[PDB]
Design a protein around this ligand. Structure first.
Ligand SMILES: [Zn+2]
Ligand SMILES: [Zn+2]
Lengths: 1105, 293, 96, 527
């Protein structure tokens, strides 16, 4: 295939012709490597062993091996014995992935280590294989299964350990004062101690003149005074010994168990100064040299050290803790607690009968792993709306979590784009809300260091000749060399065609320098953008805010019942879908032996067989439908890497998040007013925006005060007609159509005899009914839900099924809903243009082209220009070209506008899929040229003119619209904000037992929050009775609400409101604070607040007669 | 002077200063500090139960130490722990490190219920959740008159449910009111005529958060509309700052004659054209409308 | 039962006499409810003898469950038979 | 359409020309004859000029019936800066720190940006979004404090019949016979009740007192050559609590005189806070600085008394002395930094110039350029002056951002700031020294006290309602003090009534409207 076709490296890839004018020197690495490489490092896998042999240190050490080598010399106070660890080994997996998801298990493999005990008294050596617990495993997709739910461990942005200098300008005299801080990996931080203010610089002991005047504040005599002042200043506890507290203080700067030298941190301070105490002294010298400006730093043995301020937001000072390092740290905690247990068990026991099995207790380790994957903010519910959301979730770089910074502590300086993020963290894709700047995404080519620093590939240039040698540079290393943009003319032999190339300066500035002085060059124009950002066509034509919204909304697209790849792509779609994993890929080449909707089996040339089972109508974490379908036929030959089956939001292997829609940019009768969107009813009738949403309903039968609940088909006061779709157990039947209020699982709960109505008790006593009284607790379909039952799963105590204490039976019902696009659903393009459907018109109402084709979607003109996304227009134009095909006129030779076009874009067939990579995409002039050579329709009519505009008829009156309207094809996604989920209404419903206000939330059938600002609005209107009614009889007035319902049902006047329960609760809280709060009447007496019990009894008794 | 303010305060008010030292701690009723079992057998208690429990355990151990004739150092340690636990009960973290639960989370004290934006003062008193209310996504209403709003049929049927039941029993569609409830819940076809009847000239309130000024809440005459989306008049968007990107709005049904009168008169959409701030027209045309004219 | 005629709301320090007058009893036990029976333990934070019954007109021991007994105090378990509503208005106390 | 976006024909030559200027600045910096801040300053002026020029050529090349032009120039939506960014060029982009980057973005989003231009643009876009996210929270907080201070202010009576008011400028007399209309007429003159009759020097009163002062009244006043009008406002209103309908004047929403039940403090707080998300001390923190009555940063002193000025010249800072003309002792100021410029003003001799040595200064004349301390203005110039000053400054901040808020709304808050006085000497009464007592209690119980300016927060916490004060801020402190002082909350206010479920004492809730007899007439019952 030609160089113009994108994704030439992927077998069976669709042919998508690219407008890119620049060759791609380096392919995109595995987009999941940020996960899999880290976890393989933690395990010490053979793959990581090979990678570390090639590109890593000569001595490889895995994460587990590192923790064990740290913990290996365990010695007691006597030193007569030691217990060592080594050689981490893993068994096979307890259960496969689908079984763990189904059974609510944890995907894990047993961990074993070799434990060696030595007895220095008798010389015995006891080597024993110890079971260290079930170790949660990472899947091929870069996830974990914890309690059956798939989870992603997000990489965390933290500061590297080291010494960081800054100068602060004081308010007095505006003087320059340099403040220094030393960040350890573990242990207490130091400043120029551990939160103790007033710490003298003199108590620890031009340049020597300011240090000399600094030394004049307190005299120093001997090794006593300074160490006693440090001892008493450290802790307020009564001084035990000045000397012994001096040595115990010396434990803080020396002992590796207390003060842990950071391997990465030691590399940072060493790379800063020199190749302990000498580091401290060199730090004082660095600060002294910072007091009076110096471009060189000197110390004993030190040389070639620059003196400079340290920017703590720079990516040389800011590293990543990947999944492997986070797990390694929690393992270190658990192993430390286990080591305390080991030292505790060593001193007291019989040294002859001890074994490594006896000393080792794995409870704190397993509890550490459990507490991590369970309770950690970095262990996250995997976001699967579509493959792109999960993929970007695995590449997410988060600044929050334990060890990071809080949301409140985050200022605007940590959020904004830093110049060292280039090629490392995408400047575009970040959350739009309060998390902006605290959550990034890894850039397409970026890679994490063994120390946790993000690198980027660069092209090494020798004497102005661009080479194919690739070098990965840290931001530190990038701040030395001069790096050139990827867009620049080059000779066919690798020479730089222009005399000089533009560059990024070391400080983060822009400069122009001759080619012989340029070191490195960008590998790709998309190097800086993330995966989702790289999928936005004409990204360079959109402003950064709108492009941010587009990148974020692609992750919100819902899988449609049928996926359609976009006519206008950037070329990132294929690798995005493949690396995401939700597509099925052939591991080995061969021929398809058999193919069904259930599975594909491929016969390899070895005679071996591989069968791939399809996920069919599976419910994702967010309720979208994950459905795989084979794209291969029986006799087909496939290759390793080729896509066998499409997944959710995939068409022939490429990410397909939406549909190509015929668009018309124009105001239409106020129905597209203010970002509202108009759709053709065709999109409803032909199901082009339709999606499947699967809901999991769960109910259990447990033990109560009055005894066990029962799941049963026999429900009192319930007709046989509404029990029709239930089986003999009372569970709805597979294939049943369930609607609002229908019974899913019948359940009864024991009731008390005091809870019967007087009439019910009259029946029970008259007929001598059963002693068991029950209430109908059956699981019912919530409001606004419809669908068919696609699955039933049932668990019982009668079997071996593990259930929580008290729970006898647990049944889950899965309901699948086919959702056609509706008024109120949210749509968006890739450029950040978005809105809700405000009208869905009959097909005959839509504006239609001269040939009678109705447009699919009408976007309002006023929305486009001010949002500063013009790509949506550009794409539209290109879309139409790709839709209609084109033939460029070469008869007299290639026109100058097509000169830079590859020979494959000089003509295209109708419905041609096309790639316009970001920053390399289709140029303005080339697009304008293509608009002229567009092929006609079946009648020879050219429907769209050279401007991109067509003449449309009004489908209502019939008159033609007087001016040509821009029409074309735009790629529109159905966002996961859907009116079916949003609509909620309540007249009356459940209330809280605590505050006696209506419950909140739609799932609870809750009421709307009327807040403080809404009360301000009510008061500004002067509406007293509306405000009082809202806050009394409509909320917490317990008698007022029932009496109001009576009044409405009887057609009477609404009664006078009572006293809110909130005020009584306030008084009870004040009293619980020992505040005596009494409500005084006019005469000065204290009123007592209660309610008469006889009223309900008088009415209830008079009811019968 | 500063000492005189507090000493004189205790002198004139009749407060016995002995009230600052407590021999008995009140206990709040259990419904305000409930305990509910979750799915999975676990139980969930308000932090108040753990605070009270710590005070109880330390107090009972103090009694045991007084009976056992323990050393004065041990008894004193228990007394200090008791004072610190009552401190954590009243105001947690005001002195020392706060008492924490699992995950090293400071427990919420009695003082925390009265403080902050999430306390019982701000969001349990000045505002509350209400009945006869709903919400949905808003779409543009161009065919509406300024005093009207489109209401999704099911939303209106739920909001007006008691009125529809009463008018349903007035006619013979429902035998009694309970069967009327059963018919409205099942959406029997007889309810749409009656619904359209009770809707008539009964105003509803629409609100879009945040409410910046009183025009953030306005009264409209609802009319039954197709679909699940609320249809909003294009002229009030400026007042609500309503863009249709997925913005949602809330509906509230005034019940009493006074509330309905306030909606029709005070808060009606067409009765407020002008900015309450500058007096300039808000319901004035903008965007496409301007273009057309 | 009462419209709001409230003229003013007064707040002052509560003495131990006030706290003991508010109290329907002293909470002497750390226990909450029984794990097997889901019944509030006696003299606990949820104890029914002081804070009131959990179920309408039902004493803790079960000798009286019915409306006929309304107002009486059970001689066995000491629980008043009344509406469980009172469980939100009834304060306990702790003797330090 | 891509065709509908027109590109300037000379863009390449314009940008090349200004690039040659920029290259000259580069050579100037290479010689060491230019400072780095001066290099960036010159480059920023160069590329500002270039962006202006490509903007001009852009507007020149566009036909007026073009859709992109039509949309902006009709007022429908958008502005021409967006059109220039789209078609012409993006221009200078801000640093992460907020500084302009010396290299502009020369591309337009029609051309598409290069990699480096896009990356640079992300700084300004990102910091913009973040700054919006914080600004909404801060504006909401200021609105909440405005509500808490003003929410009990309602219109309690039709007219208090006070003759007090303020002078408002209707116009200025140019050297020509023409009359220059006052820019503040919309928010100052318009929608006020006339305090005293406006009479032209040539004849009859054109507008009677107690009139709405609408556009017809303003046009008749200007046609009659009336350059000033005295109006009634809530600042001068004589009602003890709340304000009278006649002093507050017209309700902005209804267009008629404000109704009795109306609660104008909440309307005022909402009217001030609703635009607050548009405010970018120069910004919204200046509004908070004024409403909180904080001693401003960059304080500019004022003259305590009329007299001659001895100006002392020094390198580090200015030192000012004043010899009064009444015969009193010299008032000696000091500690005026050299970064503070001298105030330019009209002296008593009738010249427009900077403050110089040996001038003559009147009472309250601003000595230095900056923001005056409203506390000092209160002592020197009296209580009625600080109201005008504060309203004018707040209105300066809100007008500089293009937001139109009428003066009366600010006057409700400012009125709530002056409500109390300090007791310096107890004398015969029971007031404690240094305590802040309401003006009504101080005058009725009357012995020595002085007017005090309070921040809206401090004035809020000083309310007579402990229940209301506890729900605002510092709940623990409020409840401790209220408990020790055995305070009794009178339960009259719209926040207290909301808490206990009582009709708010405003609008339909006041006793006049609340209790009313309604019965049909005999004639109607007959038919
Ligand atoms: Zn009993
Ligand atoms: Zn007045």
């Amino acid at each position: 295939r030609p160089q113009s076709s994108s994704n030439n490296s992927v077998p069976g890839a669709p042919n998508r012709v690219s407008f890119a004018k620049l060759r791609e020197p380096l392919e995109v690495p595995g987009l999941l490597d940020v996960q899999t490489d880290s976890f393989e490092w933690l395990i010490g896998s053979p793959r990581w062993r090979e990678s570390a042999a090639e590109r890593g240190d000569v001595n490889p050490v895995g994460g587990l091996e590192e923790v064990l080598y740290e913990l290996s010399p365990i010695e007691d106070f006597s030193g007569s014995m030691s217990l060592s660890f080594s050689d981490p080994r893993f068994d096979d997996v307890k259960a496969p992935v689908d079984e763990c998801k189904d059974k609510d298990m944890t995907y894990a493999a047993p961990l074993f280590v070799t434990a060696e005990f030595i007895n220095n008294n008798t010389g015995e050596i006891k080597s024993q294989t110890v079971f260290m617990g079930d170790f949660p495993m990472m899947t091929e997709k870069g996830t974990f299964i914890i309690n059956g739910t798939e989870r992603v461990v997000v990489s965390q942005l933290v500061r590297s350990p080291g010494v960081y200098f800054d100068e602060t300008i004081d308010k007095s005299t505006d003087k320059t004062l340099h403040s220094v801080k030393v960040i350890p990996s573990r242990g207490a931080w130091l400043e120029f101690i551990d939160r103790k203010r007033r710490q003298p610089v003199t108590v620890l002991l031009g340049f020597s003149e300011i240090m000399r005047s600094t030394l004049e504040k307190d005299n120093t005599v001997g090794t006593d005074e300074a160490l006693l002042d440090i001892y008493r200043k450290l802790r307020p506890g009564e001084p035990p010994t000045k000397e012994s507290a001096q040595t115990l203080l010396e434990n803080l700067f020396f002992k590796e168990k207390r003060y842990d030298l950071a391997r990465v941190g030691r590399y940072k301070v060493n790379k800063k100064l020199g190749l302990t105490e000498e580091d401290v002294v060199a730090t004082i010298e660095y600060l002294v040299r910072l007091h009076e400006g110096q471009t060189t730093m000197t110390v004993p043995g030190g040389v070639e050290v620059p003196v400079e301020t340290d920017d703590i937001d720079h990516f040389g000072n800011r590293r990543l803790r990947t999944v492997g390092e986070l797990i390694q740290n929690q393992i270190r905690v658990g192993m430390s607690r286990m080591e305390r247990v080991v030292r505790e068990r060593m001193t007291t026991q019989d040294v002859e009968a001890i074994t490594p099995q006896t000393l080792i207790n794995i409870r704190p380790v397993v509890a550490a792993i459990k507490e991590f994957f369970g309770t950690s903010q970095l262990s996250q519910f995997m976001d699967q709306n579509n493959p792109l959301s999960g993929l970007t979730h695995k590449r997410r770089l988060s600044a929050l979590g334990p060890g990071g910074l809080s949301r409140e502590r985050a200022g605007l300086e940590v959020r904004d784009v830093h110049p060292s993020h280039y090629g490392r963290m995408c400047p575009i894709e970040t959350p739009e809300g309060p998390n902006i700047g605290l959550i990034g995404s890894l850039s397409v080519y970026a890679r994490v260091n063994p120390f946790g620093f993000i690198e980027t590939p660069y092209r090494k240039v020798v004497d102005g000749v661009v080479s194919d040698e690739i070098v990965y540079l840290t931001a530190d290393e990038e701040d030395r060399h001069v790096v050139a943009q990827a867009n620049s003319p080059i000779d066919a032999d690798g020479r730089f065609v222009e005399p000089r190339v533009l560059v990024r300066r070391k400080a983060g500035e822009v400069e122009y320098v001759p080619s012989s002085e340029v070191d490195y060059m960008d590998v790709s124009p998309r190097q800086m953008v993330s995966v989702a950002t790289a999928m936005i066509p004409f990204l360079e034509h959109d402003d950064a805010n709108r492009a941010l919204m587009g990148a974020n909304m692609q992750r919100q697209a819902v899988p449609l019942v049928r996926s359609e790849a976009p006519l206008v792509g950037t070329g990132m779609e294929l690798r995005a879908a493949i690396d995401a994993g939700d597509v099925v890929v052939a591991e080995e080449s061969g021929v398809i032996e058999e193919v069904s909707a259930d599975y594909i089996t491929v016969m390899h040339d070895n005679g071996t067989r591989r069968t791939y089972r399809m996920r069919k109508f599976a419910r994702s974490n967010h309720g979208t439908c994950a459905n795989q379908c084979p794209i291969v036929d029986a006799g087909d030959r496939v290759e390793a890497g080729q896509v066998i089956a499409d997944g959710p939001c995939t068409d022939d292997g490429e990410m397909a998040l939406g549909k190509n829609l015929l668009v018309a940019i124009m105001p239409w009768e106020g129905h597209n007013y203010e970002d509202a969107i108009i759709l053709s009813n065709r999109l409803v009738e032909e199901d082009v925006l339709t999606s499947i949403h699967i809901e999991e309903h769960e109910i259990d039968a447990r033990d109560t005060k009055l005894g066990a609940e029962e799941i049963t088909r026999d429900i009192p006061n319930i007709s046989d007609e509404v029990l029709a779709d239930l089986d003999e157990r009372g569970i709805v039947r597979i294939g049943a159509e369930v609607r609002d209020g229908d019974i899913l699982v019948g359940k009864v709960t024991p009731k008390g005899e005091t809870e019967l109505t007087p009439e019910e008790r009259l029946l029970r006593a008259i007929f001598g009914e059963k002693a068991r009284e029950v209430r109908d607790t059956s699981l019912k379909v919530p409001h606004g839900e419809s669908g068919k039952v696609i699955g039933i799963r049932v668990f019982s105590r009668e079997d071996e099924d593990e259930l929580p204490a008290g729970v006898n039976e647990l049944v889950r019902v899965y309901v699948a809903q086919k959702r056609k696009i509706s008024d109120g659903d949210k749509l968006a393009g890739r450029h950040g243009n978005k809105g809700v459907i405000g009208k869905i018109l009959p097909v005959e109402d839509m504006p239609f082209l001269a040939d009678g084709t109705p447009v699919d979607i009408i976007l309002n003109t006023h929305g486009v220009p001010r949002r500063m996304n013009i790509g949506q227009i550009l794409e539209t134009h290109l879309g139409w070209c790709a839709h209609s095909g084109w033939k460029v006129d070469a008869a007299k030779g290639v026109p100058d506008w097509a000169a830079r076009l590859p020979d494959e874009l000089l003509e295209a067939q109708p419905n041609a899929i096309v790639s316009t990579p970001v920053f390399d995409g289709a140029q303005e002039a080339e697009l304008q040229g293509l608009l002229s050579c567009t092929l006609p329709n079946r009648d020879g009519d050219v429907l769209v003119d050279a401007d991109g505009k067509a003449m449309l008829f009004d489908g209502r009156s019939g008159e033609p619209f007087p001016y040509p309207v821009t029409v074309g094809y735009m790629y529109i996604m159905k966002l996961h904000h859907l009116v079916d989920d949003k609509i909620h209404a309540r007249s009356t419903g459940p209330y809280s037992m605590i505050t006696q206000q209506p419950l909140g939330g739609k799932a609870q059938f809750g009421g709307q929050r009327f807040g403080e600002m809404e009360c301000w609005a009510m008061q500004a209107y002067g509406a007293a009775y509306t405000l009082q009614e809202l806050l009394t009889i409509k909320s917490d007035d317990t008698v007022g609400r029932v009496k109001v319902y009576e009044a409405i049902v009887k057609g009477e006047n609404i009664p006078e409101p009572g006293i809110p329960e909130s005020f009584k609760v306030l008084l009870k809280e004040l009293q619980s604070l020992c505040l005596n709060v009494e409500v005084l009447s006019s005469d000065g007496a204290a009123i007592e607040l209660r309610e008469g019990e006889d009223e309900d009894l008088e009415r209830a008794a008079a009811n019968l007669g | 002077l500063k000492r005189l303010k507090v000493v004189a305060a205790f002198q004139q008010s009749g407060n016995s200063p002995m009230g600052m030292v407590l021999d008995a701690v009140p206990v709040i009723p259990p419904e305000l500090r409930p305990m509910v079992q979750l799915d999975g057998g676990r139980f969930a208690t308000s932090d108040l139960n753990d605070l009270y429990r710590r005070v109880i355990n330390r107090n009972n151990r103090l009694k045991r130490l007084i009976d056992l004739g323990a050393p004065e150092i041990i008894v004193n340690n228990e007394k200090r722990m008791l004072q610190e636990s009552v401190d954590a009960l009243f105001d947690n973290g005001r002195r020392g490190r706060p008492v924490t639960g699992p995950g090293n989370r400071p427990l919420k004290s009695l003082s925390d219920l009265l403080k902050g934006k999430q306390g019982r003062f701000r969001q349990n008193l000045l505002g509350k959740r209400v009945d006869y209310s709903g919400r949905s996504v808003i779409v543009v209403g161009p065919q509406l008159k300024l005093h009207q709003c489109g209401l999704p049929k099911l939303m209106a049927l739920e909001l007006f449910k008691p009125f529809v039941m009463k008018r349903l029993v007035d006619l013979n569609h429902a035998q009694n009111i309970k069967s009327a409830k059963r018919m409205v819940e099942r959406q029997r076809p007889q309810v749409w005529d009656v619904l359209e009847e009770v809707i008539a000239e009964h105003p509803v309130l629409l609100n879009r958060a945040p409410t910046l000024h009183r025009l953030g809440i306005q009264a409209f005459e609802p009319m039954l509309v197709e679909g699940k989306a609320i249809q909003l008049h294009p002229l009030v968007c400026e007042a609500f700052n309503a863009d249709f990107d997925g913005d949602q709005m809330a509906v509230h049904l005034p019940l009493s004659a006074e509330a309905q009168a306030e909606a029709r008169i005070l808060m009606l959409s067409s009765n407020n054209i002008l900015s309450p701030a500058s007096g300039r027209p808000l319901a004035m045309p903008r965007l496409d409308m301007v273009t057309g004219l | 039962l009462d419209v709001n005629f409230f003229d003013e709301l007064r707040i002052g320090l509560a003495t131990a006499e006030d706290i003991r007058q508010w109290s329907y009893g002293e909470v002497k036990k750390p226990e909450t409810i029984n794990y097997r029976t889901l019944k509030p333990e006696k003299d606990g934070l949820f104890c029914e003898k002081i804070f009131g019954p959990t179920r309408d007109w039902e004493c803790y021991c079960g000798k009286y469950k019915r409306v006929r007994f309304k107002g009486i105090i059970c001689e066995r378990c000491g629980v008043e038979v009344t509406r469980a509503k009172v469980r939100r208005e009834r304060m306990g106390h702790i003797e330090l | 359409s891509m065709a509908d976006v027109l590109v300037p024909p000379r863009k390449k030559e314009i940008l090349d020309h200004y690039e040659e200027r920029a290259d000259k600045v580069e050579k100037q910096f290479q010689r060491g004859a230019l400072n780095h801040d001066e290099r960036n300053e010159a480059l920023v002026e160069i590329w500002k000029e270039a962006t202006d020029e490509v903007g001009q050529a852009l507007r020149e090349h566009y036909p007026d019936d073009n859709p992109i032009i039509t949309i902006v120039d009709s007022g429908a939506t958008g502005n021409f800066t967006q059109t220039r960014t789209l078609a012409g060029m993006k221009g200078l982009v801000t640093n992460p720190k907020g500084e302009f980057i010396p290299r502009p973005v020369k591309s337009s989003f029609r051309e598409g940006l290069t990699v480096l231009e896009y990356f640079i643009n992300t700084h300004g876009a990102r910091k913009g979004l973040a700054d919006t996210a914080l600004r909404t929270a801060d504006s909401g907080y200021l609105t909440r404090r405005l509500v808490d201070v003003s929410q009990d202010v309602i219109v309690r009576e039709h007219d208090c019949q006070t003759e007090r008011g303020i002078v408002v400028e209707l116009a200025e007399r140019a050297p020509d016979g023409t009359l220059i209309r006052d820019p503040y007429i919309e928010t100052s003159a318009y929608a006020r009740t006339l305090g005293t009759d406006a009479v032209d020097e040539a004849g009859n009163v054109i507008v009677e007192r107690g009139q709405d002062l609408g556009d017809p009244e303003i046009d008749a006043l200007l046609a009659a050559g009336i350059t000033q009008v005295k109006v009634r406002s809530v600042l001068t209103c004589a009602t003890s609590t709340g304000v009278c309908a006649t002093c507050y004047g017209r309700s902005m929403a209804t267009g008629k005189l404000v109704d009795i039940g109306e609660a104008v403090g909440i309307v005022a707080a909402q009217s001030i806070g609703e635009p607050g998300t548009q405010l970018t001390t120069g910004g919204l923190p200046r509004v908070q600085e004024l409403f909180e009555a904080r001693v401003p940063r960059g304080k500019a002193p004022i003259a305590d008394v009329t007299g001659r000025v001895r100006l002392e010249d020094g390198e580090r800072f200015y030192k000012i002395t004043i010899v009064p003309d009444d015969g009193g002792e010299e008032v000696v100021y000091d500690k005026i930094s050299k970064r503070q410029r001298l105030r330019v003003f009209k002296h008593e001799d009738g010249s427009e110039r900077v403050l110089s040595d040996g001038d003559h200064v009147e009472v309250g004349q601003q000595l230095m350029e900056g923001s005056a301390d409203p506390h000092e203005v209160l002592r020197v110039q009296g209580p009625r002056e600080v109201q005008i000053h504060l309203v004018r400054e707040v209105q300066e901040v809100y007008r500089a951002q293009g937001v139109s808020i009428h003066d009366k709304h600010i006057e409700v808050i400012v009125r709530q700031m002056l409500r109390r006085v300090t007791i310096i000497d107890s004398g015969s009464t029971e007031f404690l020294p240094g305590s802040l007592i309401d003006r009504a209690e101080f005058e009725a119980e009357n012995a020595a006290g002085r007017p005090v300016l309070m921040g809206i927060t401090k004035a809020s916490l000083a309310t007579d309602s402990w229940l209301s004060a506890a729900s605002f801020q510092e709940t623990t402190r409020v409840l401790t003090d209220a408990a020790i002082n055995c305070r009794s909350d009178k339960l009259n206010g719209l926040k207290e009534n909301v808490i206990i479920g009582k009709l708010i004492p405003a609008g339909t809730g006041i006793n006049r409207y609340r209790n009313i007899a309604v019965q049909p007439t005999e004639e109607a019952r007959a038919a």
